[PDB]
């Protein structure tokens, strides 16, 4: 099957450059353009440009004049994209694709995609989070269902992983989108169950936090 | 550079339905444009090229239309799978041009909020912080309103807010919201109140604690 797999999340300080990979199978790699494309939270698509391997063609967007270059090993079936003097704005996911083959047409559409690698530039410093449990209040608890919670506050950069009784709790999960203030992230996530699961069995969060090298599992307890 | 516009963020439709997605371009584009499909967290995929070709795979379905600036994504028949961000993309100058996509939602039965509160953990506390937080789960439709009361008099500064996009298995909505005191302030108060506003009443949800309780 035809896939395009990316390298992984990349963390950089201001003024550092990074080198993205783009491992293309299974196909003719020097018979299709590689594109790459830059999402920044809240904003559309970018296109950064596109490099021909084998044959070394490349085009860029002109606002990406000094920032992106690219390089395509043939060896390897690989693409791969530099960016140089990393600023805040340049935090972003980034997307490598094939551009479909075309004829006179010149429909110049993708139809593969990677999965994208995220990059963050920042000064900030890594904090590695708290994590907090959410057990319902001392008093009663009538319904068939009780919902637990864990709080994951004050960490930095994204992302984090959260996960119930190591993934095995997956129904009745929600993880809530994180939120920034300073320069740091505060993340939460609801668990419910059924009155008769807990507190007769335990319920765990298990949160990962690569960029400071961290993971915690907090068991939710009773309160009393 | 050649601006895609697609005015419309998100959009409705029950199952069955017919929806359509717009996408404008600041300049002629002849028939060079193509659609995507991007589900939650997973990788676009390729929908229509030269405005109205289906690409090989893609149900009938969807359809394309338009040509020179006006351009329309078309959906019959709407299924659970097609919950997903749907965007343009321009190729007949480079560089080429993306729109920022628009999200389909999918209708479904009013549903009021299951509301749960939950006060500071002791270990934050250790820290001095002190944080409350509120879930408002599984509500339809997205809009929903929270307040916060201390010992009964509402409660603005220190709330953030988080929401979840329209679950893929039930299509509702969730919401949570935190409210962070410092101990020495939260000390200093007994009843804490989460109240959940929302269209299917006009009786506000109430979930509330006290300090004192155990």
């Known amino acids: 099957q035809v896939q395009l797999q990316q390298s992984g999340a990349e963390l950089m300080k201001p003024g550092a450059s990074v080198k993205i990979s783009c491992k293309a199978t299974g196909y003719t790699f020097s018979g299709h353009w590689i594109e790459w494309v830059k999402q920044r939270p809240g904003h559309g698509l970018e296109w950064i440009g596109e490099?021909?391997?084998?044959?070394?063609?490349?085009h860029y967007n002109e606002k990406f004049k000094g920032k992106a270059t690219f390089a395509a090993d043939t060896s390897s079936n690989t693409a791969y994209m530099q960016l140089s003097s990393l600023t805040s704005e340049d935090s972003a996911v980034y997307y490598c694709?094939?551009?479909?083959?075309?004829?006179?047409?010149?429909?110049?559409?993708?139809?593969?995609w990677g999965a994208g690698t995220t990059v963050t530039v920042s000064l900030a410093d890594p904090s590695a989070p708290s994590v907090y449990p959410l057990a319902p209040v001392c008093g009663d608890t009538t319904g068939s269902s009780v919902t637990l919670g864990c709080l994951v506050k004050g960490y930095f950069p994204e992302p984090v992983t959260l996960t119930w009784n190591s993934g095995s709790l997956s129904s009745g999960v929600h993880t809530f989108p994180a939120v920034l203030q300073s320069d740091l992230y505060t993340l939460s996530s609801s668990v419910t169950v059924t009155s008769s699961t807990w507190p007769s069995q335990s319920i765990t969060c298990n949160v990962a936090h690569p960029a400071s090298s961290t993971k915690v599992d907090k068991k939710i307890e009773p309160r009393g | 550079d050649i601006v895609m516009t697609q005015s419309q963020k998100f959009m409705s439709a029950s199952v069955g339905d017919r929806v359509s997605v717009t996408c404008k371009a600041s300049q002629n584009v002849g028939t060079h444009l193509a659609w995507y499909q991007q589900k939650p967290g997973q990788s676009p995929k390729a929908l229509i090229y030269?405005?109205?070709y289906r690409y090989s795979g893609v149900p009938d379905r969807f359809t394309g239309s338009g040509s020179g600036t006006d351009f329309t994504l078309t959906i019959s028949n709407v299924q659970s799978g097609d919950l997903a961000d749907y965007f343009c993309q321009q190729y007949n100058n480079f560089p080429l041009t993306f729109g920022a996509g628009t999200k389909l939602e999918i209708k479904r039965a009013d549903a009021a909020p299951t509301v749960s509160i939950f006060p500071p953990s002791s270990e934050q506390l250790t820290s001095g912080g002190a944080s409350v937080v509120c879930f408002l789960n599984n509500f339809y439709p997205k809009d929903i309103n929270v307040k916060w009361k201390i010992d009964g008099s509402e409660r603005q500064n220190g709330v953030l807010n988080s929401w979840t996009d329209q679950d893929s298995k039930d299509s509702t909505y969730s919401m949570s919201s935190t409210l962070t005191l410092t101990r020495d302030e939260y000390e200093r108060h007994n009843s804490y109140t989460c109240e959940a506003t929302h269209k299917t009443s006009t009786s506000p949800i109430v979930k509330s604690f006290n300090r004192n309780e155990c």
């Open positions: 694709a094939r551009l479909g083959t075309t004829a006179v047409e010149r429909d110049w559409y993708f139809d593969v």
């Open positions: 490099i021909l391997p084998g044959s070394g063609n490349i």
């Open positions: 030269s405005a109205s």
